[PDB]
C-alpha cells in the first residue's frame, strides 16, 4: 500500500530570506512579523490558497503564544461560511527535528448587486450560520462589516476575519459591555444597507454615531438607560428625544422585490427580521438561534450548516513544553 505522493512528498522554492518547503499539491507559489505568506494553487482542492510559514515559533514565548492560539483557534472555527484553516504540515518528521509550521488558508460589490428575496435570505442565512459557529466556539466577532464578507458568483458567503464604527452596536458605542448579539446588530446594519443602498448609521464622528441611531430608532427605554454608567446615562438622557421612524418608512415595500404574491409576504418577513436586529437594547434584540428560525431565514435551515458542531470551545510554559504543544497540534492533522 503506497502512500499518496501529492500529499506526502515535498519540494523547496526560494522566497525572500527563507526556503518554502511545501507539499507537492501546492503549486505556483507567489509571495503576498508573524511570518512569510505565499499565495498558491492547491491541485487537490482546485482552489487558490495562502501558505504561511512559521519558522521556529517555539523559539520565543511570544511567538509560541501567537502560534499555539492561531492553531487551536483556527481548528475550533472551521465552517463552510468562514475563511477556514484547510491544512497544517511540517517537513520535519520528529519532535527533536521539528522547526517549521505551515498553515494553509482559503485565499479570498454584492451590496450594490440587484438581489431577489431568495438570494438576500440565503446570504443572511449564511452570515447567521457563520456567526452561530463562532459563538459556539466562544468567539464573538464584534467587527462584522461588508469589507470582511466575501460572496462567490453562486452566492456562497464566507466571513474573512474573527480577530469602522458604522456597524458597531449601541452597547459597544456607549461602552456598556456586550454579549454575542452585538453581531446581530452588525447583520441588521448590513441587511439594511443591502436593501436601502447606503450605510444605515453613518456618524461623522463617534459622538454623531449615537445621534444617527436615536434619530432613526428613537430614544431607548428607561430600562436601557438605567443600565448605563451614571456619566453615560446623563449624556444619553440630555440628548434631544426622538420617537423613532417606523420600519415601513425607513424600509418601504418598493425597495424590496415586489413582483409576486410570495414577494409581498417575504417583504413583511424581511422587515420584521430587520426590526428585531436593529434594536438598541441588546436584552430585546433577536438572538442568532431565533434569527436562524425566523420565517425569512429558516427556508434555508439545514442542521449540517446551522448546528455544525465546533471541534472544541476556545478559552506560561518552558520552550520545550511550547514545542511539544505546537508539534502535537500539527500531528493532529496527520
Is 37 annotated to bind a ligand? Reply is yes
Is 32 annotated to bind a ligand? Reply is yes
Tell me how many helices (H) and strands (E) the chain has: 12, 9
**Helix (H) or strand (E) segment spanning residue 20:** strand 18-23
Query: Is residue 190 a contact partner of residue 128, using CB atoms and an 8 Å limit?
Result: no
CA distances from 119 to 33, 67, 133 (A): 40, 38, 21
**Burial degree of 14 (CB within 10 A; 0-12, 13-18, 19+):** exposed
Q: Is 22 left (phi over 0), alpha (psi -120 to 50) or beta?
A: beta
Q: Count the neighbouring beta carbons within 10 Å of the beta carbon of residue 250.
A: 19
The cell for 63 is 511567538
User: Rounded to 5 degrees, what are φ and ψ at 279?
Assistant: -120, 120
Q: Is 114 left (phi over 0), alpha (psi -120 to 50) or beta?
A: beta
Q: Write down the residue that cell numbers 425607513 correspond to.
A: 250
Is 288 annotated to bind a ligand? Reply is no
The cell for 333 is 492533522
The cell for 80 is 463552510
DSSP letter assigned to residue 79: B
Q: Which of 139, 140, 185 is nearest to 166 (CA)?
A: 185
N residues, the chain: 334
The cell for 332 is 493532529
**C-alpha–C-alpha distance, residues 188 and 2, integer Å:** 53
Report helix, strand or coil for 190: helix
**C-alpha–C-alpha distance, residues 251 and 280, integer Å:** 17
Is 35 annotated to bind a ligand? Reply is yes
Catalytic residues: 143
**Helix (H) or strand (E) segment spanning residue 30:** strand 26-31
Method of determination is X-ray
CATH of the domain at 275: 1.10.510.10
The cell for 174 is 456607549
The gap from C-alpha 32 to its chain's centroid, in whole angstroms, comes to: 22
Handedness of CA 164, 166, 167, 168 (dihedral sign): positive
**Burial degree of 327 (CB within 10 A; 0-12, 13-18, 19+):** middle
The cell for 132 is 452561530
Is 52 annotated to bind a ligand? Reply is yes
Contacts of 272 (CB under 8 A, 6+ apart): 294, 295, 296
Owning domain of residue 129: 110-307
For the sheet containing 85-89, what is the strand order?
A: 26-31, 36-42, 47-55, 100-106, 85-89
Contacts of 228 (CB under 8 A, 6+ apart): 174, 176, 236
Instruction: Give resolution in angstroms.
Output: 2.2
Query: Is residue 264 a contact partner of residue 253, using CB atoms and an 8 Å limit?
Result: yes
Q: Is 82 left (phi over 0), alpha (psi -120 to 50) or beta?
A: beta
Query: Is residue 292 a contact partner of residue 129, using CB atoms and an 8 Å limit?
Result: yes
Is 33 annotated to bind a ligand? Reply is yes
The cell for 309 is 458542531
Query: Is residue 132 a contact partner of residue 183, using CB atoms and an 8 Å limit?
Result: no
The cell for 38 is 505565499
Tell me the HSE value of 74 on the side-chain side, using a 13 A CA sphere. Answer: 21
Query: Is residue 291 a contact partner of residue 309, using CB atoms and an 8 Å limit?
Result: no
Report helix, strand or coil for 15: strand
Amino acid at each position: 500500500m503506497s502512500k499518496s505522493k501529492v500529499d506526502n512528498q515535498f519540494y523547496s522554492v526560494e522566497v525572500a530570506d527563507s526556503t518554502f518547503t511545501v507539499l507537492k499539491r501546492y503549486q505556483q507559489l507567489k509571495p503576498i512579523a508573524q511570518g512569510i505568506v505565499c499565495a498558491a494553487f492547491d491541485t487537490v482542492l482546485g482552489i487558490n490558497v495562502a501558505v504561511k510559514k512559521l519558522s521556529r515559533p517555539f523559539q520565543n514565548q511570544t511567538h509560541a503564544k501567537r502560534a499555539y492560539r492561531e492553531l487551536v483557534l483556527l481548528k475550533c472555527v472551521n465552517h463552510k461560511n468562514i475563511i477556514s484553516l484547510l491544512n497544517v504540515f511540517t517537513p520535519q518528521k520528529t519532535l527533536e527535528e521539528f522547526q517549521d509550521v505551515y498553515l494553509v488558508m482559503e485565499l479570498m460589490q454584492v451590496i450594490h448587486m440587484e438581489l431577489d428575496h431568495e438570494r438576500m435570505s440565503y446570504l443572511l442565512y449564511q452570515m447567521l450560520c457563520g456567526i452561530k459557529h463562532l459563538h459556539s466556539a466562544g468567539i464573538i466577532h464584534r467587527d462584522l462589516k461588508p469589507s470582511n464578507i466575501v460572496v462567490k458568483s453562486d452566492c456562497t458567503l464566507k466571513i474573512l476575519d474573527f480577530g469602522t464604527r458604522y456597524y458597531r452596536a449601541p452597547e459597544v458605542i456607549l461602552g456598556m459591555g456586550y454579549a454575542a448579539n452585538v453581531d446581530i446588530w452588525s447583520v441588521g446594519c448590513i441587511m439594511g444597507e443591502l436593501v436601502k443602498g447606503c450605510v444605515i448609521f453613518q456618524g461623522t464622528d463617534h459622538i454623531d454615531q449615537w445621534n444617527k441611531v436615536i434619530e432613526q430608532l428613537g430614544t431607548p427605554s428607561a430600562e436601557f438607560m438605567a443600565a448605563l454608567q451614571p456619566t453615560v446615562r446623563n449624556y444619553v438622557e440630555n440628548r434631544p428625544k426622538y420617537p423613532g421612524i417606523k420600519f415601513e418608512e425607513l424600509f418601504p415595500d418598493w425597495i424590496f422585490p415586489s413582483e409576486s404574491e410570495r414577494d409581498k409576504i417575504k417583504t413583511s418577513q424581511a422587515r420584521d427580521l430587520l426590526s428585531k436586529m436593529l434594536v438598541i437594547d441588546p436584552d430585546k434584540r433577536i438572538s442568532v438561534d431565533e434569527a436562524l428560525r425566523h420565517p425569512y431565514i429558516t427556508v434555508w435551515y439545514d442542521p449540517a450548516e446551522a448546528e455544525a458542531p465546533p471541534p472544541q470551545i476556545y478559552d506560561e510554559h518552558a520552550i520545550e513544553e511550547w514545542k511539544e504543544l505546537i508539534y502535537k497540534e500539527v500531528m493532529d492533522w496527520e
